[PDB]
Amino acid sequence: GCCSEPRCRYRCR
Numbered sequence: 001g002c003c004s005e006p007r008c009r010y011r012c013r
Contacts, residue, residue, distance in 0.1 A: 003012030 001012070002008030
């Protein structure tokens with residue numbers, strides 16, 4: 001996971 005966090009804005013797939 002990562003999209004839920006701000007660190008992965010457009011990164012999280």
